[PDB]
Amino acid sequence: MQGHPEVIDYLNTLLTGELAARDQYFIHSRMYEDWGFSKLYERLNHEMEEETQHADALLRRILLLEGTPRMRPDDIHPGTTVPEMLEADLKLERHVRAALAKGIALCEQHKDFVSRDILKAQLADTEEDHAYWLEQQLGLIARMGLENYLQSQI
Amino acid sequence: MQGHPEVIDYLNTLLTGELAARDQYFIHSRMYEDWGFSKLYERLNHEMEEETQHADALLRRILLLEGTPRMRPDDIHPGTTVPEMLEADLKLERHVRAALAKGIALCEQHKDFVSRDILKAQLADTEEDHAYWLEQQLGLIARMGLENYLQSQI
Amino acid sequence: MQGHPEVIDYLNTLLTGELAARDQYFIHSRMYEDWGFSKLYERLNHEMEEETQHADALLRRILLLEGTPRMRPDDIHPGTTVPEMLEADLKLERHVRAALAKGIALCEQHKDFVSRDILKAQLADTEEDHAYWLEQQLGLIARMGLENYLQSQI
Amino acid sequence: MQGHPEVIDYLNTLLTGELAARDQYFIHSRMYEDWGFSKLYERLNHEMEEETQHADALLRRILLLEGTPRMRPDDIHPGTTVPEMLEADLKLERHVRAALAKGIALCEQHKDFVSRDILKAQLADTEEDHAYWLEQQLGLIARMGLENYLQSQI
Amino acid sequence: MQGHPEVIDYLNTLLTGELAARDQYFIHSRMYEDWGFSKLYERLNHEMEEETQHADALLRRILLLEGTPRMRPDDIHPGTTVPEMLEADLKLERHVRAALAKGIALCEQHKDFVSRDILKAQLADTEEDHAYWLEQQLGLIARMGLENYLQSQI
Amino acid sequence: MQGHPEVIDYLNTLLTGELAARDQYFIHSRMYEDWGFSKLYERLNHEMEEETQHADALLRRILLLEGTPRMRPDDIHPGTTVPEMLEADLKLERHVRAALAKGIALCEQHKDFVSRDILKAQLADTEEDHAYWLEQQLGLIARMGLENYLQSQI
Amino acid sequence: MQGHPEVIDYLNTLLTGELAARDQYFIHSRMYEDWGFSKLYERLNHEMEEETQHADALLRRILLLEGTPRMRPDDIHPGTTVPEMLEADLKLERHVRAALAKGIALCEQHKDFVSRDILKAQLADTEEDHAYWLEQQLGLIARMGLENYLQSQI
Ligand code: NA
Ligand code: NA
Ligand code: NA
Ligand code: NA
Ligand code: NA
Ligand code: NA
Ligand code: NA
Ligand code: NA
Ligand code: NA
Ligand code: NA
Ligand code: NA
Ligand code: NA
Ligand code: NA
Ligand code: NA
Ligand code: NA
Ligand code: NA
Ligand code: NA
């Protein structure tokens, strides 16, 4: 089935974003492990896997709609300390949140309701799982101090 | 432990190559699935997972050596038909083979024997698993014809 | 127990033949695997194992009869394509068939009935298992065409 | 098989080093236990066992090569506080790393490839397991403070 | 992938050597059984199987490198008494050891690191398993006498 | 609890003795294995483990008493033949026996009854297990001859 | 059997001491629980049970020796904060240690070796289990601070 060209283009924009998010969580999880923060490695490794699944869902939808997926990831922006890394991932998730919301509106406009539903599922993951968790970590640092927070993530 | 700068740089060159190979097998496996060739999807999906493990091993080694991983994948070059896709993946694996062999020689020269061993393991995977399998598929097409070959991959 | 010298000599002739057949099926099975014909690899690998057992039975009988086994295999004649390999193995099995039948007659003449029985067991394997299967494969190529046959052996 | 005298001598130098490392981790693990840091006792007790296995591999190789093992351990240099003990073990592992790398080069030069492979296995353990872990602990102290770090090791 | 002609030729030299070693242990194991030394039969039968695996690894590597395997075994040199058989197998294993070491150096020179690794694995088997065991048996004969040694191998 | 300085010093003397005994049984067990005497390897490997436990008990007691353990092993004196090795280990165990008995008397004198009990446990192991077994082996050699004895230890 | 009156009297002195120690650990364990330090409650509750077993062993021995047990516990001296409670229990265990050592000497003098052995078992518990653990806790407070220590005992 040929999808609407505007929708296929927008899905491709989301795809390169998710390929990049996957890779930013790849490098951050391994950086966390390099420093001995096993709990932070485990969570970001999980979020890398979630992003790979998000990317896969978009890629498959684009092919189903007879489009050609764009596989070049967007640039990533890794941090250099734990607070910078949390903040950088939260900034990225806020960007993805806004991009997904715009995409849901566009899919509704072009009457592509299945693509809309794919994006809504990813939007709920973005808001309720990764972004919320990042906000929580930054809030814990603010409440107990960075040193106590880091101790808790060994 | 601070690694030798030339070795760290070369590992980074291999890393961006493996991130790209992962993504080329991501798109090819899903293209194969889009056309209904389940056996080709299954093999390339497996090879995508293997490439992710190769990339992970290099990334972790670079961090251990106190280097900074380069996460921008090299460009990929997907094909548009099954023969083109097999040929494109074989070309990529031949490139990776040559790059790994050069890296093993460089690691020996700089007396980084653990990095050498990591690359040798990936070299054996490259020669004996993916590249050999691709050569076999292209040889089967040549022996039984493309139509019979495609039938066998449903 | 000292065996009859003519019988021991003839068993040695069969032994060098079976050592050679083992090795011809060793190289053919791995050639089949090299090309991606897993079903042909599996059958010839099995027939290599059967030949090793045939050789072992003859070797042990020669020692029991106080003879000295000849361990130099006869020359082998591998093919270069699937039809040539099937034909070459069928030619070899026809040669072994004739040699075993001659040996059974010789054992009867010299009243070595246990050696006769060992050869009869190998003769039945030769006629009813490997040679018959090879004839069947060549007949399938003739009935469905080489390309369809090769497809079936992946 | 008589080994090359230079290689046997060098393996003996490594052996007395590993016997000493075993004993330095013996005393440090029990010191950690004496102070109530169970997690540090457990890790160093494990590393003592690993060193015993390293020493055993070298000793057996020297005997196989018809050499006579030197069983006098090198001197050890235990610390008196947790940071000093971590630093002392990291210094020792860095020394062993350099000694193994030199030994691998020497084995290659004298074409003793099996001894080279034994040393490479120990080199990978040294770099990727104990030395890396020690670097991580010292980095955790630097990131969260010594008091928080010690709390985490109870 | 086309291998380096010098490496393929050398692998073929090793292959005919391993096919011969397989057959020398075939005849010796059965000779040991013929005399009632079950423990010597069991060990040499195992070493025959190991040699078959060594030969298989070389054969498959030669095919992968697009070479043509040479399947004519080298001549064998069986002994006529238990001490002669042990000595003959030890001489053969020392020859294989030297040939493998030369091959590892040649593979390094031609930058064929996977072939090098295949040979190193076989080299370790040769030095640490069969050759060492043969040296041990000859040493036991020297320490307890041949008659006591033979009794122990029933 | 601060131990009596004379008792702590004496425990340290026993500790360096047990570290040495551990290492003498390490080298002897592997020498026995090198010659193919599996039963002698197994027993001395066990006695090496027992000595490690003896050393550990002393080391921990010294730390508990707020002393500083001495980790330099005494010199060892390995033999070069099976009878010399048995005799050398029996001489060492007789030395340890005398040293432990002296230590038990000293602990009683200084009213350190728990240290006394630790030494009594080791004394019983020394007399009733290793030393007695060594005496038995030397007696078996004397009763059946060295060649028969060695045969029994394969 | 009538015990020596001096020994029976001394065992009674130890009995009233152990009845008191039981009760001091009864009140401290429940105080720790009252404040929410579950780990400190669990350890002191265990030590209360151990003291009950110590008291039981002495009581039964006194009856066996036809003596009359004294069941009035000595006075206890509970602390009012965690550091005071640890210190008070360590002072009590040091007192019990000295009393047991004196009792062992007295039992030896009066040739009551079974009573001596009962006291030695309790002495080892006192030195190696409770007193050592208390010393460790006070040392942890000194190394990480009281606030971190208390956090670890929730
Ligand atoms: Na996402
Ligand atoms: Na996400
Ligand atoms: Na790869
Ligand atoms: Na690959
Ligand atoms: Na046959
Ligand atoms: Na056959
Ligand atoms: Na067909
Ligand atoms: Na080591
Ligand atoms: Na180590
Ligand atoms: Na071999
Ligand atoms: Na071999
Ligand atoms: Na005997
Ligand atoms: Na001992
Ligand atoms: Na002992
Ligand atoms: Na008590
Ligand atoms: Na107590
Ligand atoms: Na804390």
For residue G100, which of G133, G65, G54 has the smallest C-alpha distance? G54
**Dihedral (CA of A137, A139, A141, A144) sign:** negative
Cα atoms in the 13 Å half-sphere on the side-chain side of D83: 10
Long-range contacts of B109-116 (CB under 8 A, 24+ apart): B110/B4, B110/B6, B110/B7, B111/D101, B111/D104, B111/D105, B112/B3, B112/B4, B112/B7, B113/D101, B113/D104, B113/D120, B113/D123, B114/B61, B114/D120, B114/D123, B114/D124, B114/D127, B114/D128, B115/B3, B115/B7, B115/B11, B115/B61, B115/B65
Show Cβ contacts of residue D1 under 8 Å, excluding neighbours closer than 6 positions: D64, D65, D66, E94, E97, E127, E131, E132, E135
Can you read off the two tokens belonging to residue B128? 């004996």
Q: How far is the CA of D15 from the centre of ligand 11 (A)?
A: 28
Burial of E40 (0-12, 13-18, 19+ CB in 10 A): buried
Ligand nearest to the CA of E122: 10
Whether G101 sits inside 8 A of F111 (CB atoms) is yes
Q: Beta-carbon neighbour count of residue B120 at 10 Å?
A: 19
Q: How far apart are CA A24 and CA C96, in angstroms?
A: 66
**Dihedral (CA of G143, G144, G147, G153) sign:** negative
Long-range contacts of E119-128 (CB under 8 A, 24+ apart): E119/E14, E120/D113, E120/D114, E120/D117, E121/E57, E122/E54, E122/E57, E123/D113, E123/D114, E123/E97, E124/D114, E124/D117, E125/E50, E125/E54, E126/E93, E126/E96, E126/E97, E126/E100, E127/D1, E127/D64, E127/D114, E127/E97, E128/D64, E128/D114
8-state DSSP, C80? S
Q: How many CB pairs under 8 A join B and E?
A: 23
Q: How far apart are CA E81 and CA E84, in angstroms?
A: 5
Q: Do chains C and F touch (3 or more CB pairs under 8 A)?
A: no
Q: Do chains E and C touch (3 or more CB pairs under 8 A)?
A: yes
Whether G123 sits inside 8 A of F114 (CB atoms) is yes
b/e sequence F4-43, b meaning 16+ C-beta within 10 Å: beebbebbbebbbbbbbbbbbbbbbbbbbbbbbbeebbeb
Show Cβ contacts of residue E149 under 8 Å, excluding neighbours closer than 6 positions: E82, E137, E140, E141, F151
Can you read off the two tokens belonging to residue C113? 């009935």
The answer to whether the CB of E128 falls within 8 A of the CB of D64 is yes
Q: How far apart are CA E18 and CA E56, in angstroms?
A: 9
- Choose the closest CB to C27 out of E31, E71, E78: E71
Q: How far is CA C39 from the centre of its chain?
A: 19
Q: How far apart are CA E132 and CA E142, in angstroms?
A: 15
The answer to whether the CB of B71 falls within 8 A of the CB of A25 is no
- Please report, as a single letter, which amino acid is at residue F53: Q
Can you read off the two tokens belonging to residue B9? 């740089």
Show Cβ contacts of residue G153 under 8 Å, excluding neighbours closer than 6 positions: G32, G37, G38, G39, G40, G82
The answer to whether the CB of F32 falls within 8 A of the CB of F44 is yes
Q: How far apart are CA E152 and CA F150, in angstroms?
A: 11
The answer to whether the CB of B78 falls within 8 A of the CB of B26 is no
Q: How far is the CA of E154 from the centre of ligand 8 (A)?
A: 42
The answer to whether the CB of E130 falls within 8 A of the CB of F26 is no
Whether D152 sits inside 8 A of A148 (CB atoms) is no
B129: annotated binding-site residue? yes
The answer to whether the CB of E150 falls within 8 A of the CB of E38 is no
Residue whose structure tokens are 């030297």: E98
Whether F150 sits inside 8 A of E136 (CB atoms) is no
8-state DSSP, D154? -
Conformational region of residue G111, where left means phi above 0, alpha means psi within -120 to 50, and beta covers everything else: left
- Choose the closest CB to C150 out of B136, B137, B143: B143
Q: How many CB pairs under 8 A join A and D?
A: 26
8-state DSSP, F110? T
B77: annotated binding-site residue? no
Show Cβ contacts of residue F47 under 8 Å, excluding neighbours closer than 6 positions: F25, F29, F89, F130
For residue F17, which of F83, F102, F84 has the smallest C-alpha distance? F102
- Please report, as a single letter, which amino acid is at residue G87: E
Whether B135 sits inside 8 A of E1 (CB atoms) is yes
Cite the annotated binding site of D by residue number. 18, 46-47, 50-51, 54, 93, 129-130
Q: How far is the CA of G124 from the centre of ligand 15 (A)?
A: 10
Domains of chain A: 1-154 (1.20.1260.10)
Q: How far apart are CA A1 and CA B16, in angstroms?
A: 35
Site from B97, B106, B125, B128 to mutate, E interface, most E CB atoms within 10 angstroms: B128
The answer to whether the CB of F16 falls within 8 A of the CB of F72 is yes
Cα atoms in the 13 Å half-sphere on the side-chain side of D97: 22
Site from B26, B52, B54 to mutate, A interface, most A CB atoms within 10 angstroms: B26
The answer to whether the CB of B115 falls within 8 A of the CB of B61 is yes
- Choose the closest CB to B27 out of A33, A64, A69: A69
B127: annotated binding-site residue? no
Q: How far apart are CA B46 and CA B48, in angstroms?
A: 5
- This entry's atomic model was obtained through X-ray
Show Cβ contacts of residue C140 under 8 Å, excluding neighbours closer than 6 positions: C149, C152
DSSP-derived 3-state class of residue B1: coil
Residue whose structure tokens are 């981790």: D25
Q: How far apart are CA E50 and CA E128, in angstroms?
A: 13
Site from F22, F63, F66, F77 to mutate, D interface, most D CB atoms within 10 angstroms: F63
- Please report, as a single letter, which amino acid is at residue G53: Q
End-to-end CA distance of chain F: 50
Max distance between CA atoms of chain F, in angstroms, equals 55
Q: Do chains C and D touch (3 or more CB pairs under 8 A)?
A: no
Q: How far apart are CA D51 and CA D69, in angstroms?
A: 16
**What is chain A's alpha carbon radius of gyration, rounded to the nearest angstrom?**
17
F18: annotated binding-site residue? yes
Q: How far apart are CA B129 and CA G138, in angstroms?
A: 60
Q: How far apart are CA A58 and CA A52, in angstroms?
A: 10
Going from the C-alpha of B107 to that of each of B100, B101, B124, D114, F140, the distances in angstroms are: 10, 10, 16, 19, 57
Tell me the nearest-neighbour CA distance from C31 into chain E, angstroms: 7
The answer to whether the CB of F139 falls within 8 A of the CB of F146 is no
The answer to whether the CB of B123 falls within 8 A of the CB of B102 is no
Please report how the helices A38-64 and B5-34 are oriented relative to each other, as an axis angle in degrees rounded to 10.
40
Q: How far apart are CA C87 and CA A150, in angstroms?
A: 72
Q: How far is the CA of B135 from the centre of ligand 2 (A)?
A: 38
Which residues sit directly before a break in chain G (C to N > 2.5 Å)?
none
- Choose the closest CB to E117 out of B94, B101, B120: B120
For residue C97, which of C24, C18, C29 has the smallest C-alpha distance? C18
For residue G85, which of G152, G40, G147, G144 has the smallest C-alpha distance? G40
Show Cβ contacts of residue C120 under 8 Å, excluding neighbours closer than 6 positions: C104
Can you read off the two tokens belonging to residue E38? 């079950």
Q: How far apart are CA E153 and CA E40, in angstroms?
A: 6
Cα atoms in the 13 Å half-sphere on the side-chain side of F5: 0
Residues with CB under 5 A from ligand 2 (ion): A 130
Backbone angles phi, psi at D120, to 5 degrees: -65, -40
Going from the C-alpha of G76 to that of each of D140, G21, G25, the distances in angstroms are: 43, 7, 10
Q: How far is the CA of B67 from the centre of ligand 4 (A)?
A: 24
Instruction: Please report the DSSP string for G91-148 in residue order.
Output: HHHHHHHHHHHHHHHHHHHTT-HHHHHHHHHHHHHIIIIIIHHHHHHHHHHHHH-HHH
Can you read off the two tokens belonging to residue E113? 């690191």
